[PDB]
Structure formats: structure tokens, C-alpha cells
Design a protein around this ligand. Structure first.
Ligand code: GNP
Ligand code: MG
Length: 160
């Protein structure tokens, strides 16, 4: 079976583990010894997933930032899934710009849409997509909503 390599990356607390469990079925109740590698199958193909340490940027200021940056550069994931918090877009987009700059094949998972909704915050996904030039997948991972959309967007993005 054909396999692809996928990395999850994003700010602390955005829902990386929640999405990792949702995609791969690993760590059925996280936060004891969290798995950071796993896989899922979609439309006859296999997707190996790695959950990278939470970072705010990719300079060389912490162990985690060095670990994240080395993975993208040297391991060359087929797709980087940049998970962003819908309720703190400006903060998250800093990391996002650095990922674009380094030439990563990128896909944006826009999490916590349920929180945004309940706080009256509106995100124009189609407009965000047009501006960035990157595909955007709206989801609420803790409610397990938009997970199949993410699997689908991923399987298309690895070929792009
Ligand atoms: N409202 C809402 N909360 C969410 C959603 N996804 C995750 N959360 C919450 O956000 C918090 C962080 O979840 P987690 O997935 O562990 O984030 P993380 O990115 O792995 N954190 P870390 O950087 O420490 O590894 C948890 O309280 C989780 O319940 C979502 O879709 N909606
Ligand atoms: Mg985590």
C-alpha cells in the first residue's frame, strides 16, 4: 500500500494531540505516555502521522523549536498540517508564515471552530484560503467534527 508522511505542527494548546488521537486512534485518553507517531488509512492509501512539539515560531530559541525545524528540513514531510486556533488567528499565523517561507507543502487545519462560534468570532475561510494560497480545513476536533474532511483534504494535498 502507498504511504505518505504527514507532520502536525502548531502553537501550544491548539489541539494537536486531540487531532492526532482523532486521526490515528492513538492515546484514547490523553492528558499517560503519549504516542507521537501513528497512522490512518484513507481511500486505499496510508498516512503516517507525527505530532511535532508545540512551537510559536521556527527560530532557534528552544529545544522544541530546533526539533520542529530539523524535522521539516531534513525529514521532508509530504505534507505539513499547520493546526491553528480559530480564536487566536494573528498569533498563530506567525508560525504559518515561516512554514511558507521554508517551502513546506502546507495545509491549514483551523481548529476550535465551536469556540469561535460561541464567542461570536467569524472566520471567512474562503477568503483566508484565497489570500494565503493554502487550503484551509475548518474543524472542531474535541467535538470530532470535520475530521473526515481533514483526512480528505490531506489525501489531495499530498499529491499537490
Ligand atoms: N473548544 C475547543 N477546545 C478544543 C478543541 N480541540 C482541542 N481543544 C482543547 O484545547 C486544549 C489543548 O488540547 P491539545 O490537543 O492537548 O492541544 P495541544 O496542541 O496538543 N497542546 P500542546 O502544545 O501542549 O501539546 C484542551 O483543553 C482541548 O480540550 C476544539 O476543537 N474546541
Ligand atoms: Mg499535545
Amino acid at each position: 500500500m502507498k504511504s505518505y508522511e504527514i507532520a502536525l505542527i502548531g502553537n501550544p494548546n491548539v489541539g494537536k494531540s486531540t487531532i492526532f488521537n482523532a486521526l490515528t486512534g492513538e492515546n484514547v485518553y490523553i492528558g499517560t505516555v503519549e504516542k507521537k507517531e501513528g497512522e490512518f488509512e484513507y481511500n486505499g492509501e496510508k498516512f503516517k502521522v507525527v505530532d511535532l512539539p508545540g512551537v510559536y515560531s521556527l527560530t532557534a530559541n528552544s529545544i522544541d523549536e530546533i526539533i520542529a525545524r530539523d524535522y521539516i528540513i531534513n525529514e521532508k514531510p509530504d505534507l505539513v498540517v499547520n493546526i491553528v486556533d480559530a480564536t487566536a488567528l494573528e498569533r498563530n499565523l506567525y508560525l504559518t508564515l515561516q512554514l511558507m517561507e521554508m517551502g513546506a507543502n502546507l495545509l491549514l487545519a483551523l481548529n476550535k471552530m465551536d469556540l469561535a462560534k460561541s464567542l461570536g468570532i467569524e472566520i471567512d475561510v474562503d477568503k483566508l484560503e484565497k489570500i494565503l494560497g493554502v487550503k484551509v480545513v475548518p474543524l472542531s476536533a474535541a467535538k470530532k467534527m470535520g475530521i473526515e474532511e481533514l483526512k480528505k483534504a490531506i489525501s489531495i494535498a499530498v499529491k499537490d
